[PDB]
Amino acid sequence: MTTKRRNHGRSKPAHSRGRVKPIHCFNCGRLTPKDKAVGRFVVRRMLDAASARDVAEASPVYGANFPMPRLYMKQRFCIACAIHSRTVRARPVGNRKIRYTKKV
Amino acid sequence: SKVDTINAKLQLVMKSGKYVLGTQQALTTLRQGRSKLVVIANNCPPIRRAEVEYYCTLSKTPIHHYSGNNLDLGTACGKHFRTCVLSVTNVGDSDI
Amino acid sequence: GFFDADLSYPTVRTERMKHKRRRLVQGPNSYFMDVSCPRCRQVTVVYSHATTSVECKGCSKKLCRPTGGKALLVEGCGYRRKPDH
Amino acid sequence: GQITEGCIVCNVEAKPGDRGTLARASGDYCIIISHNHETGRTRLKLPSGQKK
Amino acid sequence: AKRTVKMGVMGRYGTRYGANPRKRAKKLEVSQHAKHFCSFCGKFAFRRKAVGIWRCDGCSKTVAGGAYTLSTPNNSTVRSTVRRLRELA
Amino acid sequence: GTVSRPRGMRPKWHKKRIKRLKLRRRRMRQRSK
Amino acid sequence: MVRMHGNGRGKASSALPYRRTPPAWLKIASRNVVKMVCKSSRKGMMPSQIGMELRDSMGIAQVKNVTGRKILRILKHNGLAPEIPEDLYFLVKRATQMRKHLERHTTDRDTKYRLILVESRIHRLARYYKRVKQLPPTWKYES
Amino acid sequence: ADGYTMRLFVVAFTKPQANQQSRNCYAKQRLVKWLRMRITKMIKRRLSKVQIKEAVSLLTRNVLSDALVRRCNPILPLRELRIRKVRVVRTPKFDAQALLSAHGTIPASVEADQR
RNA sequence: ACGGCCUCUAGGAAUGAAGGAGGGUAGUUCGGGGGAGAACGUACUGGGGCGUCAGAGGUGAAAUUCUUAGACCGCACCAAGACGAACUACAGCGAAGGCAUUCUUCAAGGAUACCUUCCUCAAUCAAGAACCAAAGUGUGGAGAUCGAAGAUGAUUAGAAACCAUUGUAGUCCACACUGCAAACGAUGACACCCAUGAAUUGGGGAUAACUUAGUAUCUUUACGGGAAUAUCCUCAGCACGCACGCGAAAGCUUUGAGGUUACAGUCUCAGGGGGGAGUACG
RNA sequence: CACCAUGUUCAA
Ligand SMILES: NC[C@@H]1O[C@H](O[C@H]2[C@@H](O)[C@H](O[C@@H]3[C@@H](O)[C@H](N)C[C@H](N)[C@H]3O[C@H]3O[C@H](CO)[C@@H](O)[C@H](O)[C@H]3N)O[C@@H]2CO)[C@H](N)[C@@H](O)[C@@H]1O
Ligand SMILES: [K+]
Ligand SMILES: [K+]
Ligand SMILES: [K+]
Ligand SMILES: [Mg+2]
Ligand SMILES: [Mg+2]
Ligand SMILES: [Mg+2]
Ligand SMILES: [Mg+2]
Ligand SMILES: [Mg+2]
Ligand SMILES: [Mg+2]
Ligand SMILES: [Mg+2]
Ligand SMILES: [Mg+2]
Ligand SMILES: [Mg+2]
Ligand SMILES: [Mg+2]
Ligand SMILES: [Mg+2]
Ligand SMILES: [Mg+2]
Ligand SMILES: [Mg+2]
Ligand SMILES: [Mg+2]
Ligand SMILES: [Mg+2]
Ligand SMILES: [Mg+2]
Ligand SMILES: [Mg+2]
Ligand SMILES: [Mg+2]
Ligand SMILES: [Mg+2]
Ligand SMILES: [Mg+2]
Numbered sequence A: 001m002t003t004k005r006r007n008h009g010r011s012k013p014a015h016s017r018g019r020v021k022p023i024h025c026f027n028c029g030r031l032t033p034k035d036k037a038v039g040r041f042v043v044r045r046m047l048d049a050a051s052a053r054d055v056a057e058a059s060p061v062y063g064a065n066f067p068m069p070r071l072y073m074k075q076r077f078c079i080a081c082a083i084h085s086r087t088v089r090a091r092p093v094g095n096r097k098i099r100y101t102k103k104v
Numbered sequence B: 001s002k003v004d005t006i007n008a009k010l011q012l013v014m015k016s017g018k019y020v021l022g023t024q025q026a027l028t029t030l031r032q033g034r035s036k037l038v039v040i041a042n043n044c045p046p047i048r049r050a051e052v053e054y055y056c057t058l059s060k061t062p063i064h065h066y067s068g069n070n071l072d073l074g075t076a077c078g079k080h081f082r083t084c085v086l087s088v089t090n091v092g093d094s095d096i
Numbered sequence C: 001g002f003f004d005a006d007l008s009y010p011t012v013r014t015e016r017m018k019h020k021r022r023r024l025v026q027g028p029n030s031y032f033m034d035v036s037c038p039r040c041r042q043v044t045v046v047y048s049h050a051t052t053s054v055e056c057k058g059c060s061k062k063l064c065r066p067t068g069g070k071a072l073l074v075e076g077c078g079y080r081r082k083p084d085h
Numbered sequence D: 001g002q003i004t005e006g007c008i009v010c011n012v013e014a015k016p017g018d019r020g021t022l023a024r025a026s027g028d029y030c031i032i033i034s035h036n037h038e039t040g041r042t043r044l045k046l047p048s049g050q051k052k
Numbered sequence E: 001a002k003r004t005v006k007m008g009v010m011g012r013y014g015t016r017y018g019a020n021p022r023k024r025a026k027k028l029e030v031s032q033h034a035k036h037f038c039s040f041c042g043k044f045a046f047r048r049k050a051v052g053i054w055r056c057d058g059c060s061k062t063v064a065g066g067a068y069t070l071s072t073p074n075n076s077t078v079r080s081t082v083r084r085l086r087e088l089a
Numbered sequence F: 001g002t003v004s005r006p007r008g009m010r011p012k013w014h015k016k017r018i019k020r021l022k023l024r025r026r027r028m029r030q031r032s033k
Numbered sequence G: 001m002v003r004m005h006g007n008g009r010g011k012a013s014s015a016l017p018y019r020r021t022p023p024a025w026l027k028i029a030s031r032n033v034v035k036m037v038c039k040s041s042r043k044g045m046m047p048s049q050i051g052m053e054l055r056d057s058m059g060i061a062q063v064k065n066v067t068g069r070k071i072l073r074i075l076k077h078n079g080l081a082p083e084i085p086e087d088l089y090f091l092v093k094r095a096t097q098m099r100k101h102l103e104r105h106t107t108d109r110d111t112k113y114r115l116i117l118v119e120s121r122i123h124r125l126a127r128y129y130k131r132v133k134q135l136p137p138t139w140k141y142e143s
Numbered sequence H: 001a002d003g004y005t006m007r008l009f010v011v012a013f014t015k016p017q018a019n020q021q022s023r024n025c026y027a028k029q030r031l032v033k034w035l036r037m038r039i040t041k042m043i044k045r046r047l048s049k050v051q052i053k054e055a056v057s058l059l060t061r062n063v064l065s066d067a068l069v070r071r072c073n074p075i076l077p078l079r080e081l082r083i084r085k086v087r088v089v090r091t092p093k094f095d096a097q098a099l100l101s102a103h104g105t106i107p108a109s110v111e112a113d114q115r
Numbered sequence I: 001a002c003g004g005c006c007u008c009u010a011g012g013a014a015u016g017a018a019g020g021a022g023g024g025u026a027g028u029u030c031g032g033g034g035g036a037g038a039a040c041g042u043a044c045u046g047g048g049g050c051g052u053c054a055g056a057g058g059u060g061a062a063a064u065u066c067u068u069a070g071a072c073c074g075c076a077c078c079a080a081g082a083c084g085a086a087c088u089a090c091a092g093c094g095a096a097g098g099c100a101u102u103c104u105u106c107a108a109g110g111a112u113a114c115c116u117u118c119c120u121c122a123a124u125c126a127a128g129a130a131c132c133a134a135a136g137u138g139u140g141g142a143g144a145u146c147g148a149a150g151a152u153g154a155u156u157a158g159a160a161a162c163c164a165u166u167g168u169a170g171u172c173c174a175c176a177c178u179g180c181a182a183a184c185g186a187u188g189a190c191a192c193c194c195a196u197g198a199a200u201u202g203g204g205g206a207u208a209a210c211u212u213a214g215u216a217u218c219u220u221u222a223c224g225g226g227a228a229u230a231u232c233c234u235c236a237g238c239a240c241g242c243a244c245g246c247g248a249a250a251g252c253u254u255u256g257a258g259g260u261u262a263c264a265g266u267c268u269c270a271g272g273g274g275g276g277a278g279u280a281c282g
Numbered sequence J: 001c002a003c004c005a006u007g008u009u010c011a012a
């Protein structure tokens, strides 16, 4: 009914472009426009602190001088999965305009 | 840019020079020694082309191998008919 | 207190920054230059925004190269701005 | 063996010297898949789709 | 004045053989009876004289190509491929 | 939901029901003439 | 170009000076400027090119300011004016080149769209020139 | 030189300058194509007149890599350029002597010997 | 520059070039714009080759399913059809629909630059014309993946749904149709005025109402007198937080939904309580 | 992320 967002929930200004090719949601595979989907670049450790300690102890390669490899993933979620996984939450109306331009 | 320039010189010849259309008239100019340039379409029959080049070689007349066919050559001259061979006898202001 | 801007008589700083067609009275940005050829050693008047092929009469060498805006003068040649009027 | 792979051919000899037995009907052709110099053979795609 | 609204050349068949078979045949029939460009001699004078056989009224050349048109799209693709492979060698 | 009260079935399905109804009526007239 | 056929709003253009007097350092006579204009025309150059060459290599900013006559007027007086107006000639040439490309490239729908705009521009331009009798009546661009 | 065909797969990244204040360092496309052509010309020139053994030495010791970045930086400021993948796509007919020349002195194997 | 015989001699008298339109030239500018051709990239699936042996798959839990006739898994390959990840942005291009690997090509297109040309040629538009995502239709191809219909297994009081394993038409290409989208900014086109801060894409320029009020950094033997940054100015483009004013409010704000009862710049489309109904008839 | 269907008519 009422216009909830000025940008309509996507990064597509009225005279920028017509169509943005959709992507599959990282979790459920739902097709959503790439400029709309909630995008997160995640750098995860391959092992938690305890397991990495044990593997580093047994490794002649990995130790204090050589770090273990990490996983790098660009995850794009549909809106429903982003909310349900708590990657993003409903916010107060005045806080909806708050944007972050770098990972904190 | 193979055809754009020669078309421009053809237009200038068509406007301010003296030319002849057709193999027979072109050969007559070559025999008379009055030809300054001979333009040959790319679909000219091989025996006719070879005869024209041989005449031009004997008369030391320059040859331009046009990148279009006889239909294109006639259009470039501004005519509504095909021409295999064009012989320029006066260059006018073309500089070709 | 400072001087208020007058629309009919703008200041030098305000007028100098404006687009040539956004000035109070529109006018050209271009000019003419006397160019001495590095090879012909002769003076030729060259437009500051020349887009065609400018060549020295003697050497037949290009005196400038066209660009998006002002023409670029070849190295060696000396240029002098001629008066606008 | 002298024809490059990927070329489109017709009047193909099934046997050397048979003077043409494959790809003869109107609009038909064979496609050269590959050459095998070790055995001296050539692989073709016949109009029916079979490889020979 | 126009004598048929849409039948065109197929009007010789009257009400027989069905609209769709008539339409499909018409496209190829117009092509086979039409004059086609001759790359030699630069004229629009190629006419069919048998299935797959075309003779130019201008230069009298005879060319084997196409059941209902002078050159098929497959032949055009093959011509470019052979030229490209010839350059590659 | 992203819409207000339809005061009926979903309009897309009401449109489809009408579409099927129109198809049936034009078939009945065809068999009649 | 800018506004007709394609919602471009560009403003790039020349800005003619207020003072129209030829500069004092320009010693060339008006009769010689006319001679160069005719000579350049005989070499096949169009009036637009004639002005640019005089501007670039002769220090003649405005032929009209020097001779009192526009370049096309000088050509008309000497019988050197083009048979077809310059802008119409260039639009026709562009349309012909585009049609030549389309003969092979039948699926270049963008070019077909641009061709419609060019041919529409030609027909509107032709209507104006026939009205002011710069084109013969019954002149028609043929696709 | 010995008939080995390889595919090189170079990747490079643009970088901001030291004093840059812009929010991105995207490159003009004409510079990207210029970077591609210079990389292609250098790699073809350097690898076409050497054998596979010398080519592997150049690749594994980064001699070609340092040459590429040094000569490509003036075209475009690069954060890093590297050869991410080299693959042999066609090998010549097998030659026992060439293999032995590549292996030089072969260390002995004691696997078949008695314990 | 000076002087001199002969020949030719309608020829300079026209408002101005719109911060209106159209053309021209240039950087051989700019761009996921369009068309053509040749290649590349992993991945899905399949196929054998080379190994292994008891499970694999799938789910909330299972089953349909595959499997000692060797599944799943591992390595290197081969085939075929799609697709062009990360980089990918409140970024670019296009009239809209739309557009993303590289190289080679074919016509374009906007912007910028100009003391080039031209001279009202324009704005908006019934009729008419062309284009138009997906699905759908016709004829040939193609058919890896996904998958309307259908099949099987679960869940359930029922479940011919959601979930699982599949699978036809399709999904892809050529040509020809169709012209039904929340085809949306739910905001018609052209033109004028309009306050502030930080950015961004493309091209240029510079380093008693005052007469003129800086500045660098990095790379640098050939698409190289180069490339990118820095400060300032500028025109054109997509926008952000931000003063009037407006609005029923949400909100809009040089990007109006402002400049409107202090109501008139121009043209055009549509609406007149809710249903019946975008139905019936033609 | 197994499975949660329904609530007679006016009027406080
Ligand atoms: N292109 C040549 C032109 O022909 C003109 O003459 C033509 C016109 O008088 C007239 O042409 C008419 C035209 O007036 C009217 N506006 C349109 C009409 N279609 C034309 O008719 C013409 O074209 C149609 C098909 O296109 C033909 O069927 C018809 O036979 C033919 N007369 O008939 C002649 C066609 O042969 C004039 N002589 C002159 O404009 C010019 O020379
Ligand atoms: K979003
Ligand atoms: K919308
Ligand atoms: K933009
Ligand atoms: Mg709501
Ligand atoms: Mg949205
Ligand atoms: Mg745009
Ligand atoms: Mg859309
Ligand atoms: Mg360790
Ligand atoms: Mg002042
Ligand atoms: Mg809700
Ligand atoms: Mg509503
Ligand atoms: Mg317009
Ligand atoms: Mg940038
Ligand atoms: Mg004007
Ligand atoms: Mg296997
Ligand atoms: Mg990619
Ligand atoms: Mg209009
Ligand atoms: Mg479709
Ligand atoms: Mg069939
Ligand atoms: Mg499946
Ligand atoms: Mg509609
Ligand atoms: Mg809009
Ligand atoms: Mg609407």
Ligand SMILES: [Mg+2]
Pocket (backbone or CB within 6 Å): I201, I202
């Ligand atoms: Mg841009």
Ligand SMILES: [Mg+2]
Pocket (backbone or CB within 6 Å): I242
């Ligand atoms: Mg604002």
Ligand SMILES: [Mg+2]
Pocket (backbone or CB within 6 Å): none
């Ligand atoms: Mg009113």
Ligand SMILES: [Mg+2]
Pocket (backbone or CB within 6 Å): none
């Ligand atoms: Mg009503």
Ligand SMILES: [Mg+2]
Pocket (backbone or CB within 6 Å): J007
């Ligand atoms: Mg109740």
Ligand code: NA
Pocket (backbone or CB within 6 Å): none
């Ligand atoms: Na596999």
Ligand code: NA
Pocket (backbone or CB within 6 Å): none
């Ligand atoms: Na096996």
Ligand SMILES: [Zn+2]
Pocket (backbone or CB within 6 Å): A025, A026, A027, A028, A029, A030, A077, A078, A079, A080, A081, A082
């Ligand atoms: Zn999801």
Ligand SMILES: [Zn+2]
Pocket (backbone or CB within 6 Å): E038, E039, E040, E041, E042, E043, E045, E056, E057, E058, E059, E060, E061
């Ligand atoms: Zn012929």
